[model samples]
Target chain A: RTEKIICRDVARGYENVPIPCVNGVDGEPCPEDYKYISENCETSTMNIDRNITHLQHCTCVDDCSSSNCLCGQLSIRCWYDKDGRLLQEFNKIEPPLIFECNQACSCWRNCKNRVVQSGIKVRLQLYRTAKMGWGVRALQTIPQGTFICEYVGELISDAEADVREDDSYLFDLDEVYCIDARYYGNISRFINHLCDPNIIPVRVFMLHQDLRFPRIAFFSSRDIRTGEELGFDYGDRFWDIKSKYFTCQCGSEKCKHSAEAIALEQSRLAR
Target chain B: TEKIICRDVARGYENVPIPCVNGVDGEPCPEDYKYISENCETSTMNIDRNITHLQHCTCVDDCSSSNCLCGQLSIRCWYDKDGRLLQEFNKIEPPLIFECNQACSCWRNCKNRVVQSGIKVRLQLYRTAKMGWGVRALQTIPQGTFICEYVGELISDAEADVREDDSYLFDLDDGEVYCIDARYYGNISRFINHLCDPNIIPVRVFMLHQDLRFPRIAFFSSRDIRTGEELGFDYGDRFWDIFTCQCGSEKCKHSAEAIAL
Candidate 1:
C-alpha cells in the first residue's frame, strides 16, 4: 500500500513493487504476490553482496557434471530440473538444501542446480479471500516437492527487528533472526498462515554459516491441484500475537480455531 | 462569490475559515476556497492564540558561526553558506526549526532565517477533476526552491494520536507534539494534495528560532515543475489503506500510499 501502484491488478510486475509482479499471464509459473523492492537484495548487508547469486560459486567451465563442482563441493546438489520439475521423490519430510550455480560459475543459465535463482517460473495468481487480505493460488497443477518461490524482503539484522513495533510481515529464521518483508518483499510475503499448509518453508544454507540468517525457500509437500491457495504453517506463536480480534479463517478441516491453534496460549496463561 | 474571497495582488492569499475536516467522514471545505487564512494572523496561530511560539535567537556578529546563540541551540546547519538546503536525510543532524525571528541579532537578509520570510511565489487554487481542491504554481518554480513551511498547532504526540481525523497533520519526528496540524490555521501548502509521482517533496528541517517541539516541514521541488503543474508529495506508504489516492500518476499504487515509509 505504500508505493504509487496505479494498476489494481495486484499481479502487475515490479514496476511498482520492483520484484517483477508478473501474474503468469503466459501460463508460466509466476508468483502473483506483491514484492517490496526495498529488500536491498542487490546490496544486502549479508557478506554476500545482493548481486552475488551465491556465496562461493566456482567457475564451472562446462556441463557442470563433475562432483567436484564448486556448488557440489559444498553439498549444493541439483534438486530440480531447469523447468523446476522435481526429479527425485520428495515427501513433506524435508526439502533439498540450496547449492545453486551463481554468476561466477560458467554453467549454462539452464543449469539444473539453479532452480531457486531462476526466479518464479510457475504460474501463480492473486486471489481475494472472504476474510484474509490476499492469497496466492497456482493456476496449474503443482507436483510434490516443486519449488514455488522465495520469501524475500529487506534482510534486516535481529536487533533491527527488535526495535520495530509492527511485526505483521516478519518471517522468523530461527531463535535470534527474522526477515522483515513488510516494506520490501516478494510474493511469499503475502502467504498467510494455516494449521495445515500444502507448502513447507525450509531453511537451507549455501554461501555462509551466517547462523541467525540463512537462505529460505518453499517446497510443495504434496500434489497440489489447480486453483488451490498456496500456504505454509506460520507456527502457533505467530497466531497468538495476530489473533487478537480476528479468528482463524484458514477454513481447513484441521482448523485449530483461535485458542486451539495457538501453541503459546497455555504458556501465556501459565505466565 | 461563494461567500469566500481570493487574493492575488501580493503573495498573501485569504479565504473563509472552513471547519476542520477529520478523516473520511469529515465535511468538505468549500470548493472555490484558496485556504489562505482570512485573518489567521501570522503573529499568532489559532491553536496557540495567546502565546508566541517562536524562540528568540541572538546572532549579533556572524549568524553562521557555530558559537552564535541561535546556532548553538541548533548545532547542525541543514543549509550551506548560502541559503540552500543540503537535502541530506541520512546523517544525524539536530532536529530543530531554525528560523530567524524579531529577537535574532542577525540582519533581515541573514541566511539562517529563509523560512521566516514566508511565501515569495504566487500560487493558485483550482478544483481538480478527481481530488477536491488543489494548488499549483502560478509561475514556473525552479528546483530546490523553498516552497512553504507547513505550519499549524504544535500539539503533543498524545493529543495527535487520539485525533481520528488528522488529514492535515504533518507529523514531526521530534517525539514532541508529533504533528503540525493545519486543520484550523495553516498556510497554502495544506491545499497541496497527494500525488504518486509528486513533483515536490516534504523535507523535515529544524529552525534555530522556534520551539524544539515540531521540526520545520519545508516542501522543495524534487524536479523543475511547470507553472501550471499541481504541486504534490508522496504522503508515505501507510496512508494508502486509509484513503484512495487519485494522484493520477501512471504508476499510481491505486490505494494512495508511497513505496517506502
Candidate 2:
C-alpha cells in the first residue's frame, strides 16, 4: 500500500511543517499515505490507488467563444474572474451541472472557459486543529467566492460503503454513489465539520457531466483571515448517523453539542 | 494644496485612467478610489469607498446558528459546502448591512463577509462604437456571478439634486440623505454603459455598521453572458429623461417600438 502512495505537491510557507500527523497515541495511524492527488477516480476498492476515467471534455473551433462554444451553447457554464471568483445560478432540479472546456476543446490554453483544470491557487495549509484530528487552514486572506480545493477520494458503490465503517469521511455524490476518503484521499479529507462553517462545498465537472460522480470544489464562504481554520456544515444527517460515538469538540456557539453545553451551564448555575 | 490635474488623458483612442475629485472636471484623485487603486490597503478596505464600518462578531459557537456572536445582521448570507450562494434571490430589503468584520471573534472565514471580500473577477474597459466607453467580462460570466461594485464618493441629496449632470449620481433609494457619485473618480463600474435589456443588474447593499447616509452597490449577472460581450444595466426611466437612449438593444425602452409598448 505504501508503494502505491504518490503524495501531492503543495505550495508551502508556514510556521511549522505539516504532514499526515498521526500522534499514534489514541487513534490509529494515518491511513495509507497522505498523497494529494487531484483527480477523482472510480475503483471498486480504496485499498489501492487506481487511476480511473474522470470528467468529460469539450471540442471547440476557436477561442471557445461563448456563442459558438460547444459547452457554452448548452448553457452549461459558470463565470469566474481573475481573482478566482466563480458565479452561477444553480438549476433547481440538477444543481450539480458544471461544464468546463477541457483537453478535447480547440480553445487556447489560456481560454477563460477553463477554471478547475488549474489546480488549487490559494495558499492552504494542512495543520492540526484543537480538537479536530487533522484540519486545513488558509495561509492568506482568501476572499469570498474564491475556489479553495477539490475533495478527491476513492469512488465506491453503496454496498462497499455499507460494510465500511472505518472512518466517517464519506461524501455523497448522488443516490447511488459516495466518495470514500478513508483510505485513499487528499487534503480535502482532513476538513472537519461544523454546525455553521465558513467554507461551503460546490459540485463541479470539467469535461463531462457524470451523474455518478461529479467533482467537488470547496470555496470560501467569506473573506477568510490569514490563519483562520476552514470548515463546512456537513448536515445533521451526517452527525446523527456517522458521529454516534464521536464527541464533537467544535466548541461553536451553535454547536450540535449546544444542547448539552447549555444543560451543563444550568448544572453549574445550580451549584 | 496639490495641483488639480483634470484632463481627459485618452482623447485619441486609449483607455486612460479617469481621475477626478467630486464631480469637478479636474481635481486631485477623489476620496473614493478605483477598483485596483494602488494605495488601497487590504487591511482597511470594505465594500464601498468609505472606511469599513462592520462590527466584529465574537460568537464562540456557530455563526450559522440562529443565536450568533454578531447577532442578526440585516444581510443574510449562506453557502452550501459546494459554494453556491443560498440567498442570491432573497432580497435583504434596503439598508442591507452587517458582516462579521475584523473586531469579531469570528475569523475572516466566517460566512457573513461577502461585502468586505472586495472584487475578484476579471474585468476590462474597452471602447464601444456608439456607447462611448464600456465594460466587458474578460470571460464568459455565469448567470449569478458578482462582477463588481459601483463605488463613488458619498454625497448629500441636496448636492445630488442640484447637479445639472446627475448621470453619475446613484440615489440610495432613501430621500437622498446620501448618494454615490462615480463620474470623476471611480472604478471599472463607472464606464459600464446603459442597455435597455442589460445583462447585469445593480443590487442595493449596505454594511452592518450603519450610517443611514451610505449604502453599497454591487452588480450581478442577470443571465449567462458571453465572453467579450459588453456589460450594461437599465439606468431606469428616471435617467431616461436626462440621458439619451443608445443601448442598441431590440427592447430599448427609448426605441419607437418600446414607446409603443
Candidate 3:
C-alpha cells in the first residue's frame, strides 16, 4: 500500500487542542516515540512529600480575581489578568513565586487563577525542520503573555539526572529534582534553543506543595505571528558545555555561539 | 479502603478489563445493570437472521489491498493502514462501514476488522456530580479511535414502545423493527451521558450480519480527547422532553435559544 502522509496528532489528546505533526520539509517521521503527559510525574525514587497540611488553597467562590485571594497573594502582584493571560510587564523579569489555585480550591475549574492546569489552549504544529530536526510552530497568532504550554516530564532527583548520558532535555527545578523530557514529554520538548527568543519560562506552583519542584510554564514574551517558530534561551550553562559538540543555528544577531563569535572569543582569550 | 467497585466489570468477556470506581463521591454501583460484551437476544424475540450465511471476503492478509472483496464493495476503505478512520471522511453522515467477518480469509488483525476487535482504549467507570454514573478516558484518545460498541438487549420496536423506561432504548432504524435497550444488560457505553457538544459520534457498523436494518451501533471519537475527560454523545431530540438536560455545555439546546437549522 502507498503510504500517504497523514497529519498525526502527537499529543494524542493530552492537550485541550490537537498538536499535529507534519513532515512537509523532509521525509522524517513526526518524532521519536515519547509518552505525552499533561502534568509533571514523579519517579519512584523521588522522595517528594504530598502531605495535605502543606497544601494551600483559595476560598474564593468566584474566579480568584481579588487581591485578597491567598493564591494570588503568593506573588508580589497578581500575575494574571481576568482573561487568564499573564501580565506582559512580568515577561522580562522572573517572579519569586506564582501560586495557582489547585484542586483543593473552592473556586470552579474555569477560574482565572487556574490557567496552565487547564492545558494548551492554542493550536501548535510539529513540523520537520531542514537543520534543527523537529521544530514547533504556532498555527494561529499568539498574544503576548498567553500560556503556551507546561514543560511536562518525569520528575527525577538531580542526582539521578546527573548520571544520565543525554543532557539535551534535562531541566533542573532546584537542588532537589530535575525534569527529564528525553524519553517522556509533551510537544514542548521539540522547542529548539535560541539566544534572543520570544518565549520565556515562568515557575508556577499548583498541584504540589514542594517549592523546589514548581511547574515550569512557557509564556509568549511578545505578540507572536502565525507560523513563527517558538523558542527560548537555554541559558549560558547549556552552551558552556555543549558549544564544542554542536553549533548554534538560532540565526539571531546576538548569538554568542555563532562561528564568528566563537573565533572572536578564542582570539580575545589568547591575548 | 477499596477504591475499585468492580475490578473486571466485563467479567472476562472483553479483551481488556473494564473497572468501575466510585472514588469521586459515594455514589453506589448500578443497581440492576448486568454487564455484556455483545447484544443479547431476549427470549421473546428472534432477531438473528442467520449471520453465518453472509458473504465473506477472500483476503489472506490485511483488507486494505485493492482486491479485498470487503473494501472493493464499500464506499471506500473505512479505515486507514493504521486502523483509524480516515480523517477527511465525513463523520456526521459517514458511509456504512462493513467489516470482514469470521468466514473471511483475512488475518485476525486485519484493518477492516475494527469494531469486532473489542475495546482498545482504557476507560474507567466513575461517579459524576450531577450525572449518576459516567465513563472517563484513562489515557489520551486519538480522533477516529473506536471507543466501544453499544451492546444491549435486541428487541422489536413494538416491544420497545411499551417499555416503562425508554432512556436506554436505541432504535436500530427509524422506528423500525429492531431496537437496542441497554437498561438491563449493557457494556460501558450505557453509562455514557448526553452532552450538547459531545466528542464521540455514533457510527453504524456491520460485522457478522450485513443486514442494513440491524447494523451494530459503534461509537468513535469525533475529536481528540484528553486524559480524564468525560466521554459523552448527543442523545438526539428524543430525550429533550424526557429529561432535563444536565450536560453543562455552553451550547446546550435547553439553555440556549433554538436557532433554525
Candidate 4:
C-alpha cells in the first residue's frame, strides 16, 4: 500500500512560529517565489565594509534600562520599555536613531535594548487577500509599540536598486544603500501599504556603528487584535512615482488614493 | 581585547546567511576553505545527465495530494503538507526522496521541493575546542526539517582512491564508484562533526538528475533541536580507527573500544 505523509506547518519550521499560508479567496496562487531570510544580507556588488572597526557596547548588569547604559544613551533615551515594547511617544514620527545592545555588550541576551536583533517573537500568518494578492496577518493579539519584524533583504547600493524595474519592495536607508526585497525576504515583504497603517518603520543601529545604513524595523503603532492585517505607510514618495501605474486599494477611511478617489480627482482636473 | 567576527561563509548563494565566528581564544578564521553552496564538478568528474528526460508532476495544487504524477510514481510523497519530511520515515535506511524539479508544473513552493528551496534554518559556523570547527543552530529546529545538503566536489571513485585525504570524502554508494570530497571546497555541512547518537541523519535525495548512483546527500533533523545546540550525524565505523570520537555522547563507540586497544 502507498503510504501518505501528512504535513501541516506552512513555514516548514523556518520561523519561530509556523506561518501557514491560507488561500481562502478563490484558491489564489501563492506569493511570488522568494527565499525566506531571517536577516539582511549584502550582495556581491555591495562593497560595504562590514568589518567591526571599534567596539561599542554597554556593561549593563541589569536590563540596560538605566540612564547609565552607553547603548541607551546613544539613542538619546532608551526606546523599549520593560516588556521590549517601544515607547508610545516615538510612534508618530520616525525617531532619529535607536541603538540596540550588540554582541560585545556585557548585558544578557534578554536586554531590553535588544528588540529587532532578537528576531520575530509573535505569531504571524500569510493569507491571500482579494485586493492585495498576498498579505501578512497577526495570528495572536499584539500590544501597542511591540516590535513586529524587520524589513530584511539584500543590502544593495542605490545604483544597483535604481536599475531594477520593480520598486515595490525597495526600502531606502540612505543614498548609499537600499534594501531590495524583490527576490529574497521574510514575511515583512508581504505586508501591504495602508495610509493609516497600524505599524511604523523605525531606524535601528546594532552590531555595526554605521549611521548611513541603519536596519529598518517595523513596530506596531497601536494595539492590534488577532487576525488584523499588518500594514505600514509606503510614504508619499512611493505614491508620487507609482501613482501613474497603481492606485492604493487599501480600504482604510484615510486612504490617499482609492479607485473612486482617483476617478474623482481626474474628473476635477478635467473641469 | 579580541572580538568575534560575524561573517557569511556561504557568501550569498544560500537563502539564509550562514554566519561564522572566530573563537575568543585567539583562534584565527578558518583558512584555505572556499565556500560553495552546490556540488561543484571537478575536471576529472563527468556528471552527464539530460534535463528534459526527468519526470515531472502536473499538480495545480502544492503537490500534497496522492494524484500527483511524481508522488504516484514514487508510491507516496516524501514530505508532508508543510514540506517537512514525514516523521515516520526510516532514519537508518531512508528511502530515496524524489523531489519535484524545475520541469514540474507545480510552483517553487510545492510540498515536494524542500531541499531545492535552499537552507531555511539559521546556522552558524563557530570554532570548537576539540573539533577544529563546528556548526550550531541559531534557532530552534523541528524534527524532519531539512537542514542542508552535503555539498562538495563530485569525483569518481577511482580518483577518490588515489587521493591522500579521505577525511571529507563522502561515498555516494556502497558499491557504485562515486564520492563527494569537501576537503578543498564545501558548504556548511563539511564542518559538522560525528556523534554515535546524533540529532541529524543523512537522506539520499534525487533532484534534477535521476541517477541512482549519484544521489544528493541531504541532512534532516532526527529530533527536535534547541537553539545554540550543536548539530551532527553518525559518520559510521570506517573512521573509528583513524580518529577518536570527541562527540562526548554517552554511546561513544571509540571511547569504549579505545580501552581495549
Among the numbered candidates, top lDDT falls to: 4
lDDT of each: 0.58, 0.58, 0.77, 0.78
True lDDT of residue A49, candidate 2: 14
User: Which number leads on TM-score?
Assistant: 4
Model with the higher lDDT, candidate 1 or 2: 1
Question: Which portions of model 1 miss their true places by more than 4 Å?
Answer: A1-12, A15-35, A38-55, A58-62, A65-68, A81-83, A87-96, A204-213, A257-271, B1-261
DockQ of 1: 0.01
Which residue runs of candidate 2 sit more than 4 Å off their true CA positions?
A: A1-36, A45-68, A73-77, A88-96, A257-271, B1-261
Worst 10 residues of 4 chain A by lDDT: A1-10
* Cα lDDT for residue B18, candidate 3: 76
TM-score-wise, the better of 2 and 4 is 4
For candidate 3, give the lDDT of residue B110. 76
- Residue lDDT tens for model 4, A86-188: 9887736547688898755656556778888777889887877779888889989999999998898877787887798998889988658888888767788
Candidates 1 onward: DockQ, in order: 0.01, 0.01, 0.02, 0.04
lDDT by residue (A64-125, candidate 2, tens digit) is 54456666644454455545476534333355455666533444445666666666777666
lDDT of 1 by residue, A1-271 (tens): 2222222333223322222223322332433233333122422334432222224675675555666677756654555554565555543455445566654454555555666555565677554544676667787899987888778766666787888687888888764767777655767777887767888876655434345556688888788999888888887687667778567878787787555555556677889
- Which candidate do you rate higher for lDDT, 2 or 3? 3
Can you give the lDDT of residue B96 in candidate 1?
Answer: 52
Error of 4 at B90 (Å): 26
Candidate order by decreasing lDDT: 4, 3, 1, 2
C-alpha RMSD in Å of predicted model 2 compared with the true structure: 22.9
